[PDB]
């Protein structure tokens, strides 16, 4: 082709909010994400996507858009019972170096447990053992008992766990009602 | 040779590229579309598809050059249909019509380096996007909600703001936003205010907290009261829940509360 081809200059691109997203600063956005909810994290490299996969084992990396535009999709809650059944405030914790924290530092791994985990009935088996003996905290055990009395049973596991909890509490209190947990059980039965 | 471009009877953004070659039947035409409008609406319901054919190995930034920055704050770029564009006209969409077919495009690319492949620009509408903890603090605290997603700005009907508000409301428990977050009656809010009120039970927001929880979740207030009335045993207001007598602290608990007409 002897004739030189006319070359149109591409227009100067302007980035969006989506393409200016850094996954390193999105730990307060990704953590409260619910199930089947997308959290776009902007462009991502291979080392960065491996790092994100390690820091968020509960999520999945979905390449939504070209240029590495990825999003995280929550798949399951990996929170263990001992870590987040003993408190109502904590929703997720960063685990690293064999220790648990509520503050983010580099190299940590997110661990989130189900919203209103107590209402589901997973915490009953743990707090039943934790609320007898020297490990009895009055606030947490009392609030757990009170919220167990007023519980919206949505799933079959909910009713099953509630019935097991009532049976175990009744048996333990028939054994002895002077223990603080049976005192709280009797108080909330009266209430 | 004999390269030319002519606008057609359609809109100005679409044109015809004309080749006049020595071979008589290569004197042909190709309908190509290049965009020159900054979009402020949707080409199709719920989506924007500018005619910019983003070629492979090219920065995605240019794909957003055709959208107003205000309108693009809540659109995300996804993969589009495969397309072809001239290398010397990066992003000139090629219409696969009549003799134009992807096989012909591949043959032309093999013959000469005036053709590249890629994907059509495709923006979908989901919601606004946050990128740092400062924007989350702005959205959840409701100080500045000009650009905040529905999930983080929905008047505390979902637990997306629970973690931030848990620490935010310990500084100022009397904030109307904190009380309206408490009024959602989720466990983090009630436990945070139980911890707050175990030390400041003599404050107005604790009266409102007690009015909110009871009678469904009284267990989050009683505990708080207990703590307060075991720390401030000298408070004249804890003298019904915690009687000053050393042996008789539960003197007026339960139905006995009515034996003292001050309680």
Instruction: State how far the Cα of A172 lies from the Cα of B242, in Å rounded to an integer.
Output: 29
Determine how many CB atoms are found less than 10 A away from the CB of residue A76. 11
| CA B164 to chain CA mean position, Å | 16
Concatenating the DSSP letter of every residue in A55-120 gives H-TTEEEEEEETTTEEEEEE------HHHHSS-SS--EEEEETTEEESS--TT-EEEE--TTHHHH
Q: What are the residues whose beta carbons fall under 8 Å from the beta carbon of A99, sequence distance 6 or more?
A: none
DSSP letter for A5, please: P
Measured in residues, chain A has a length of 191
Judge: B77–A69 Cβ closer than 8 Å, yes or no: yes
Q: What are the residues whose beta carbons fall under 8 Å from the beta carbon of B136, sequence distance 6 or more?
A: A28, A29, B130, B152, B164
- Tokens 């093999």 appear where? B110
DSSP letter for A9, please: P
State how far the alpha carbon of A90 is from the alpha carbons of A113, A117, A157, B164, B251, in Å. Answer: 9, 11, 23, 11, 36
DSSP letter for B75, please: E
Q: What are the residues whose beta carbons fall under 8 Å from the beta carbon of B88, sequence distance 6 or more?
A: A5, A6, A7, A8, B114
CB B117 within 8 A of CB B84: yes
Instruction: State how far the Cα of A156 lies from the Cα of A162, in Å rounded to an integer.
Output: 10
| Structure-block tokens of residue A155 | 């799933």
Determine how many CB atoms are found less than 10 A away from the CB of residue B155. 12
| CA A149 to chain CA mean position, Å | 24
Q: Any alpha helices (H) in chain B, and if so which ranges?
A: 102-111, 133-140, 162-171, 176-182, 187-197, 204-213, 219-231
CA-wise closest residue to A111 among A72, A84, A88, A71? A84
Neighbour order of strands in the sheet with B53-55: B53-55, B115-120, B82-86
Nearest-CA distance A17 → chain B (Å): 6
- Residue in B closest to A67 by C-alpha: B60
Q: What letters, b where the CB count within 10 A reaches 16 and e where it falls short, cover A33-46?
A: beeeeebbbbbbee
| Structure-block tokens of residue B134 | 């400062």
CA-wise closest residue to A30 among A60, A50, A10, A68? A60
CA-wise closest residue to A12 among B22, B209, B52? B52
Residue A1's H or E segment, with its range, is none
CB A131 within 8 A of CB A168: no
Measured in residues, chain B has a length of 263
State how far the alpha carbon of A99 is from the alpha carbons of A76, A93, A94, A105, A123, in Å. Answer: 21, 10, 8, 12, 21
| Secondary structure class of B33 (helix, strand, coil) | strand
Instruction: State how far the Cα of A171 lies from the Cα of A157, in Å rounded to an integer.
Output: 21
Nearest-CA distance A189 → chain B (Å): 12
Residue A47's H or E segment, with its range, is helix A46-55
- Phi, psi (rounded to 5 degrees) for B64: -95, 5
Nearest-CA distance A111 → chain B (Å): 14
CB B63 within 8 A of CB B122: no
Instruction: State how far the Cα of B84 lies from the Cα of B55, in Å rounded to an integer.
Output: 7
Judge: A191–B67 Cβ closer than 8 Å, yes or no: no
Q: What letters, b where the CB count within 10 A reaches 16 and e where it falls short, cover B41-61?
A: eeeeeeebbbbbbbbeebebb
CB A73 within 8 A of CB A51: no
Neighbour order of strands in the sheet with A92-96: A99-101, A92-96, A109-112
Burial (Cβ within 10 Å: 0-12, 13-18, ≥19) of residue B20: middle
Q: Which residues of B touch A44 (CB under 8 A)?
A: none
| Structure-block tokens of residue B192 | 């945070």
CB B165 within 8 A of CB B181: yes
| Secondary structure class of B70 (helix, strand, coil) | coil
Judge: B187–A88 Cβ closer than 8 Å, yes or no: yes
C-alpha triplet A114, A49, A21: angle, nearest 5°: 80
Interface test with A, best of B13, B57, B61 (most A CBs within 10 A): B61
Rg (CA), chain A: 25
Instruction: State how far the Cα of A114 lies from the Cα of A108, in Å rounded to an integer.
Output: 20
| Structure-block tokens of residue B143 | 């100080």
Instruction: State how far the Cα of B228 lies from the Cα of B238, in Å rounded to an integer.
Output: 8
Burial (Cβ within 10 Å: 0-12, 13-18, ≥19) of residue B132: middle
Instruction: State how far the Cα of A147 lies from the Cα of A44, in Å rounded to an integer.
Output: 43
DSSP letter for B79, please: -
Instruction: State how far the Cα of A72 lies from the Cα of B65, in Å rounded to an integer.
Output: 26
| CA B65 to chain CA mean position, Å | 22
Instruction: State how far the Cα of B241 lies from the Cα of B248, in Å rounded to an integer.
Output: 11
CA-wise closest residue to A10 among B62, B66, B14, B16? B62
Q: What are the residues whose beta carbons fall under 8 Å from the beta carbon of B63, sequence distance 6 or more?
A: A13, B50, B52, B54, B77, B121
Q: What are the residues whose beta carbons fall under 8 Å from the beta carbon of A165, sequence distance 6 or more?
A: A121, A124, A128, A148
| Secondary structure class of B120 (helix, strand, coil) | strand
Could you give the dihedral angle defined by the CA atoms of residues B138, B140, B142 and B143, in that order, rounded to the nearest 10 degrees? -20
Neighbour order of strands in the sheet with B123-125: B47-48, B123-125, B75-77
What technique solved it?
Answer: cryo-EM
Nearest-CA distance B149 → chain A (Å): 11
Instruction: State how far the Cα of A69 lies from the Cα of A42, in Å rounded to an integer.
Output: 5
State how far the alpha carbon of B220 is from the alpha carbons of A61, A115, A147, A148, in Å. Answer: 39, 18, 9, 12
Q: Which residues of B touch A92 (CB under 8 A)?
A: 163
Judge: B188–A88 Cβ closer than 8 Å, yes or no: yes
C-alpha triplet A40, A41, A47: angle, nearest 5°: 135
CA-wise closest residue to B200 among B231, B155, B166, B177? B231
Instruction: State how far the Cα of B160 lies from the Cα of A34, in Å rounded to an integer.
Output: 8
Instruction: State how far the Cα of B6 lies from the Cα of B29, in Å rounded to an integer.
Output: 10
CB B22 within 8 A of CB B1: yes
Helices (H) and strands (E) in chain B, counts: 7, 10
| CA A47 to chain CA mean position, Å | 25
CA-wise closest residue to B75 among A17, A36, A43? A17
The sign of the torsion formed by the CA atoms of A110, A115, A120, A125 equals: positive
Instruction: State how far the Cα of B68 lies from the Cα of B45, in Å rounded to an integer.
Output: 18
Instruction: State how far the Cα of B230 lies from the Cα of A119, in Å rounded to an integer.
Output: 30
| CA A191 to chain CA mean position, Å | 32
Burial (Cβ within 10 Å: 0-12, 13-18, ≥19) of residue A8: middle
- Tokens 């959840």 appear where? B140
CB B242 within 8 A of CB B215: no
Instruction: State how far the Cα of B114 lies from the Cα of B105, in Å rounded to an integer.
Output: 10
Instruction: State how far the Cα of A167 lies from the Cα of A185, in Å rounded to an integer.
Output: 12
């Amino acid at each position: 082709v002897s004739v030189e081809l006319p070359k149109r200059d591409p227009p100067p691109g302007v980035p969006t909010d989506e393409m200016l997203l850094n996954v390193d600063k999105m730990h307060d956005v990704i953590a409260p994400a619910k199930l089947l909810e997308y959290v776009h994290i902007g462009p991502l490299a291979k080392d960065k996507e491996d790092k994100v996969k390690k820091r968020y084992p509960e999520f999945r990396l979905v390449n939504t858009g070209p240029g590495g535009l990825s999003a995280l999709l929550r798949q399951s809650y990996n929170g263990t019972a001992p870590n987040c059944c003993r408190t109502f405030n904590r929703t997720h914790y960063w685990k690293k170096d064999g220790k648990i924290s509520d503050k983010y530092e580099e190299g940590a791994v997110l661990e989130s447990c189900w919203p209103d985990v107590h209402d589901t009935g997973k915490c009953d088996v743990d707090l039943f053992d934790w609320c007898q003996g020297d490990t009895f905290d009055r606030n947490i055990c009392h609030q757990w008992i009170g919220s167990a009395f007023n519980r919206s049973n949505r799933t079959v596991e909910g009713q099953q766990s509630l019935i097991n909890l009532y049976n175990k509490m009744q048996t333990l209190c028939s054994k002895d009602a002077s223990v603080p947990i049976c005192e709280s059980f009797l108080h909330h039965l009266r209430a | 040779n004999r390269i030319k471009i002519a606008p057609g009877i359609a809109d100005i953004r679409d044109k015809y590229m004309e080749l006049g070659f020595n071979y008589p039947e290569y004197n042909r035409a190709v309908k190509f579309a290049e965009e020159s409008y900054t979009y402020y609406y949707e080409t199709s319901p719920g989506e924007i598809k500018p005619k910019f054919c983003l070629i492979d190995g090219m920065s995605i930034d240019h794909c957003s050059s055709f959208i107003v920055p205000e309108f693009a704050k809540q659109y995300v770029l996804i993969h589009g249909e495969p397309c072809s564009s001239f290398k010397f006209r990066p992003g000139s969409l090629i219409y696969y019509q009549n003799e134009v077919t992807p096989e012909y495009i591949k043959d032309l690319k093999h013959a000469t380096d005036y053709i590249a492949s890629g994907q059509r620009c495709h923006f979908i509408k989901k919601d606004y996007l946050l990128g740092d903890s400062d924007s989350v603090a702005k959205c959840c605290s409701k100080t500045n909600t000009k650009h905040c997603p529905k999930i983080f700005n929905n008047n505390y009907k979902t637990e997306h703001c629970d973690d931030f508000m848990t620490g935010f409301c310990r500084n100022d428990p009397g904030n109307p936003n904190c009380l309206e977050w408490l009024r959602a009656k989720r466990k983090p809010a009630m436990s945070t205010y139980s911890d707050i009120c175990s030390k400041h039970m003599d404050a107005r927001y604790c009266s409102e907290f007690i009015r909110i929880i009871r009678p469904d979740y009284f267990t989050f207030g009683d505990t708080a009261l207990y703590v307060f009335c075991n720390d401030h045993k000298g408070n004249r207001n804890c003298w019904c829940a915690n009687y000053p007598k050393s042996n008789s602290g539960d003197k007026y608990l339960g139905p006995r509360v009515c034996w003292l007409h001050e309680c």
